[PDB]
Design an enzyme around this catalytic site. Structure first.
Site, PDB file in Angstrom:
ATOM      1  N   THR A 124     -41.340  -8.281 -13.266  1.00  0.00           N
ATOM      2  CA  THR A 124     -40.273  -7.369 -13.704  1.00  0.00           C
ATOM      3  C   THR A 124     -40.299  -6.815 -15.163  1.00  0.00           C
ATOM      4  OG1 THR A 124     -38.919  -9.358 -13.909  1.00  0.00           O
ATOM      5  CG2 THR A 124     -38.585  -8.047 -11.926  1.00  0.00           C
ATOM      6  N   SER A 125     -39.794  -5.589 -15.360  1.00  0.00           N
ATOM      7  CA  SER A 125     -39.658  -4.993 -16.707  1.00  0.00           C
ATOM      8  C   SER A 125     -38.331  -4.282 -16.900  1.00  0.00           C
ATOM      9  CB  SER A 125     -40.766  -3.966 -16.938  1.00  0.00           C
ATOM     10  OG  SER A 125     -41.960  -4.473 -16.397  1.00  0.00           O
ATOM     11  N   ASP A 151     -30.645  -6.899 -13.409  1.00  0.00           N
ATOM     12  CA  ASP A 151     -30.259  -7.842 -14.460  1.00  0.00           C
ATOM     13  C   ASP A 151     -31.158  -7.833 -15.686  1.00  0.00           C
ATOM     14  OD1 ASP A 151     -27.759  -8.626 -13.419  1.00  0.00           O
ATOM     15  OD2 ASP A 151     -28.558 -10.498 -12.608  1.00  0.00           O
ATOM     16  N   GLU A 208     -30.258 -14.656  -2.975  1.00  0.00           N
ATOM     17  CA  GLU A 208     -29.629 -15.389  -4.089  1.00  0.00           C
ATOM     18  C   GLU A 208     -28.162 -15.693  -3.870  1.00  0.00           C
ATOM     19  OE1 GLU A 208     -30.466 -12.967  -7.555  1.00  0.00           O
ATOM     20  OE2 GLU A 208     -29.873 -11.120  -6.550  1.00  0.00           O
ATOM     21  N   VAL A 219     -31.805 -18.069  -9.957  1.00  0.00           N
ATOM     22  CA  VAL A 219     -30.773 -17.994 -11.013  1.00  0.00           C
ATOM     23  C   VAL A 219     -29.371 -17.727 -10.421  1.00  0.00           C
ATOM     24  CG1 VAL A 219     -30.104 -17.179 -13.296  1.00  0.00           C
ATOM     25  CG2 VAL A 219     -32.488 -17.378 -12.738  1.00  0.00           C
ATOM     26  N   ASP A 220     -29.166 -16.565  -9.821  1.00  0.00           N
ATOM     27  CA  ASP A 220     -27.892 -16.240  -9.264  1.00  0.00           C
ATOM     28  C   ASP A 220     -27.568 -17.187  -8.126  1.00  0.00           C
ATOM     29  OD1 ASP A 220     -26.849 -14.011 -10.645  1.00  0.00           O
ATOM     30  OD2 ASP A 220     -28.664 -12.909 -10.027  1.00  0.00           O
ATOM     31  N   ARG A 266     -43.192 -20.578 -22.027  1.00  0.00           N
ATOM     32  CA  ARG A 266     -44.211 -21.344 -22.772  1.00  0.00           C
ATOM     33  C   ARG A 266     -44.804 -22.498 -21.947  1.00  0.00           C
ATOM     34  NH1 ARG A 266     -39.560 -19.708 -26.648  1.00  0.00           N
ATOM     35  NH2 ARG A 266     -39.931 -17.578 -25.865  1.00  0.00           N
ATOM     36  N   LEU A 276     -42.619 -13.107 -15.511  1.00  0.00           N
ATOM     37  CA  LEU A 276     -41.760 -12.533 -16.511  1.00  0.00           C
ATOM     38  C   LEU A 276     -42.555 -11.896 -17.660  1.00  0.00           C
ATOM     39  CD1 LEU A 276     -38.886 -15.068 -16.614  1.00  0.00           C
ATOM     40  CD2 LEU A 276     -38.883 -12.762 -15.726  1.00  0.00           C
ATOM     41  N   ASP A 327     -29.730 -13.495 -19.429  1.00  0.00           N
ATOM     42  CA  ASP A 327     -28.896 -12.401 -18.869  1.00  0.00           C
ATOM     43  C   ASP A 327     -27.554 -12.788 -18.184  1.00  0.00           C
ATOM     44  OD1 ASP A 327     -30.520 -12.729 -16.272  1.00  0.00           O
ATOM     45  OD2 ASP A 327     -31.958 -11.447 -17.315  1.00  0.00           O
TER      46      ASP A 327
HETATM   47 MG   LIG Z   1     -30.563 -12.540  -9.628  1.00  0.00          MG
END
Ligand SMILES: [Mg+2]
Ligand SMILES: [Cl-]
Ligand SMILES: [Cl-]
Ligand SMILES: [Cl-]
Ligand SMILES: [Cl-]
Ligand SMILES: [Cl-]
Ligand SMILES: [Cl-]
Ligand SMILES: [Cl-]
Ligand SMILES: [Cl-]
Ligand SMILES: [Cl-]
Ligand SMILES: [Cl-]
Ligand SMILES: [Cl-]
Ligand SMILES: [Cl-]
Ligand SMILES: [Cl-]
Ligand SMILES: [K+]
Ligand SMILES: [K+]
Ligand SMILES: [K+]
Ligand SMILES: [K+]
Ligand SMILES: [K+]
Ligand SMILES: [K+]
Ligand SMILES: [K+]
Ligand SMILES: [K+]
Ligand SMILES: [K+]
Ligand SMILES: [Mg+2]
Ligand SMILES: [Mg+2]
Lengths: 348, 348, 348
Positions: C12-13, C48, C154, C187-188, C232, C255, C304
């Site tokens: 994603t960007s 997001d 999600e 995440v969500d 990292r 990412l 986010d």
């Molecule tokens: Mg999400």
């Protein structure tokens, strides 16, 4: 709904072995097992345990051997037929072998308890198999529902199909009451799910085993785990069963009389003990992560069709990636050698 | 759809204890709890926490104690009634106790928030319970939907039933909106799934807890884990909650005021700390794997009906195997002794 | 049903970054990636990854950048639009951005392979999105079914929706055949499931990943794992992929170009080896369990909207508990300080 409330051992045998001799050798020996060496369920296996060019012969040997020796066999007998949710030919084949095998004139049917059906898909695929049992029973004057059906759960669709089994089985348009075992087939399942592991050893699929146990308890069937290939790994097999038993999966596949005895014993409570407190033989301590070269070889110079297919994923992935990513064509040569790239690109 | 967005503690008490005295003793004390010692949800438990010959008395004590003391109780009160997907008698019993308890003349109903229903089956079993709540509300002029219903998930069918809850609850032919908690019952669940472990300690059933959390989030209910029996094992209880909290299961069953306090505290963020870096008191360090002899004894000389049933599996298995495998009758004597074999064969 | 049989990298960007400059900077660079640095799937992310006040601008930059640079991009391009099962506004927004972006006059559509739709609910929510793809295709003379749809799994409802996908997709009233990826959004999802962990690091959700892999294999889509934030932590990312690969989940979110390269490489078989045998840099060895004070701060002085929401649970729980348990109001001050209590009570 069946005589066996619990099944600990589900043992398979090839039905027609190619090496000259008596092609029914494996079946005749196995039909001879008794005591802790005899499985609760025995599976003359006309499917993956047996080369395809041998399968019509395997079907004959099933009738010959169970005719001659079935009356004596102390467990239940359930031959695995061929089947595939995606292949009408295989399905018709499985059915025609079921019809021969159960011909009452041949003397096998009366020692046969049911059949095991591999590769089933969603519930409407189980209804096809169920329909073939029904027709076979009617063609040969067997009572309705007398042939138990057992399925190998070895695709995602079949894993999902277990969720509404209770209400599908009640529909009067099928005889799905005949269902007996729900048996995990971790081999073909690994393939259908496109899973891969570095050693090429099977994932453990705890959730499949949970789901199969759950499906069995909701539907009144009996859950059984699939093959455990590394036969020498006695302690591994016991860990897996102890593990399965914690999920309510009390039976497992057995590949050898050794496994039959270990599996027959493991769910039984111990003799004695025990108090637990908180804090060349090298082969069962090593494993080998093959390179692309080695994986190519282990089919290129060339374990059944389940073990084969189930090892082809890192290569189908490599192939997909090479077909569709010309911009990576350089780095993939940089990394495998121009030799290997162009070589791996032929396997499909 | 309910006042409590989150429930951390789900605490049960027997309703009528047999030892002479005041049979409502446990309830009167527990209705006295306040602060961190008081559960978010309190369950006068007329089901497994209470001997069957005590249950009509337990129902009376529920009215007597909540009448006398409910106004004060700082959490919500939800008595567990008896119920069973497979037993029409138990279902009618649970309903008649619900109807007495909620009689507005008796003064209990106005401090009662809902009832908890054990042993539910598939969604059409939940609709039966839902139908009894509806009738009870109408018989006593309670608003529709004012009695919350909570179910114990403690069979395979109930675990499956959570999957289409959203659309079943919307049907206008039930008042299933009243659903509040989906509470795992690992004890009876272990039994219904026929699981066994060497110590006879409960499996962890992570997938059940995942499924129950998921079901709750899709359907707007609140997921709660089941009983954690080894009460002295304070650190175990905290590990299990931390574990549950990672699944979105934020409440757990509590069996004691100690557990109420630990459970009330655990999901709250810590006071201070903390930095983590990568690399007679003997009883909580030992466990005992019983022999067949011991397992026989622990029912033969004879922990509720859930702990009993849930320990009977290795024996029902042994029984099944002995009934159906005459060829193994020798080796099973060789292994347990003629004494024990013939002895284990009577328990059912 | 799609050109890519396998997708290893889903990268994603942000589409419009606020810091003065060229707001389409991130997209222009990323559209420049080639070789092992380029994802199989690239996601200009208008959801997001991008502040809401930037989203109409992000939609323009998507057309500008893919117009100018899409022909060259060696993988497939699938921008993420906004969507939410619970919000008709967001859904209409996502659709209007899809309609602009695909305007054939603008030159982007012909390098666009499909769109990714976040936050979907149950199957009747997927049919809404599917309906918007259909209308967009018709408004712009695109072939039917030419825009692939991919969904982020999600929520609990979406996890359940995967179970009957095969038969829903066949209904002639939707074009759900267009489905391509089923992409976990841990995440969500953590948020919707109300899970919490002591470090606030994501749970591992193995069952979600199993279910998403299964759903994909039953329905002919491709399963992909969600974002792995601790960038990292190179070795962690590799453990997670090796783990995912054991479930048949062969692609993961990326990412950074670093993650694209690690992820592009990991499922490919190794160059060489290997034999395995049985028995400031401190940051990747430490973690921090925040106190209530710290958690308050990490929103109060304020990653986010997914990381935000997903960290609000221990506080919504604290809030619920304080609103409803006046009897605990003392002990909660005793424990956090009157200061912090009254302070945490404002965040909602
Ligand atoms: Mg999400
Ligand atoms: Cl077909
Ligand atoms: Cl199905
Ligand atoms: Cl594994
Ligand atoms: Cl599931
Ligand atoms: Cl079972
Ligand atoms: Cl009944
Ligand atoms: Cl159901
Ligand atoms: Cl366990
Ligand atoms: Cl919840
Ligand atoms: Cl809505
Ligand atoms: Cl749905
Ligand atoms: Cl975790
Ligand atoms: Cl996949
Ligand atoms: K039927
Ligand atoms: K029928
Ligand atoms: K079971
Ligand atoms: K309703
Ligand atoms: K209604
Ligand atoms: K939840
Ligand atoms: K369709
Ligand atoms: K259509
Ligand atoms: K898969
Ligand atoms: Mg197989
Ligand atoms: Mg129970």
């Amino acid at each position: 709904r069946h005589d066996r409330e619990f099944v600990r051992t589900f043992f398979t045998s090839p039905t027609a072995v190619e090496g000259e001799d008596d092609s029914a050798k494996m079946l005749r020996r196995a039909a001879g097992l008794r005591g802790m060496q005899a499985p609760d369920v025995w599976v003359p296996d006309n499917e993956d345990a047996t080369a395809p060019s041998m399968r019509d012969e395997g079907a004959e040997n099933i009738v010959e051997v169970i005719s001659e020796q079935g009356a004596e066999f102390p467990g239940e007998i359930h031959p695995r037929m061929v089947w595939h949710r995606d292949s009408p030919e295989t399905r018709y084949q499985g059915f025609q072998h079921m019809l021969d095998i159960t011909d009452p004139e041949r003397g096998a049917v009366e020692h046969i308890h049911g059949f095991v059906i591999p590769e089933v898909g969603g519930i409407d695929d189980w209804k096809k198999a169920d329909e073939f049992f029904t027709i076979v029973e009617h063609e040969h004057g067997l009572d309705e529902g007398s042939l138990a059906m057992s399925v190998i759960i070895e695709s995602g669709e079949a894993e999902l199909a277990m969720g509404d089994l209770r209400d599908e089985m009640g529909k009067p348009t099928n005889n799905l009451e005949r269902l007996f075992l729900l048996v995990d087939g971790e081999v073909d399942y690994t393939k259908d799910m496109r899973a891969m592991t570095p050693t090429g050893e099977l994932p453990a699929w705890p959730e499949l085993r949970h789901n199969t146990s759950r499906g069995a308890s909701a539907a009144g069937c009996v859950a059984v785990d699939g093959p455990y290939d590394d036969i020498r790994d006695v302690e591994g097999y016991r860990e897996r069963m102890t593990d399965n038993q914690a999920k309510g999966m009390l039976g497992i596949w057995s590949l050898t009389p050794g496994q039959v005895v270990e599996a027959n014993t493991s769910p039984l409570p111990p003799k004695t003990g025990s108090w637990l407190l908180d804090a060349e033989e090298l082969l069962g301590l090593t494993s080998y992560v093959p390179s692309m070269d080695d994986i190519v070889d282990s089919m290129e110079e060339f374990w059944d069709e389940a073990t084969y297919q189930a090892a082809m994923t890192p290569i189908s992935l490599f192939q997909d990636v090479y077909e569709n990513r010309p911009d990576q064509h350089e780095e993939l040569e940089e990394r495998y050698g121009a030799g290997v790239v162009e070589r791996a690109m032929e396997v499909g």
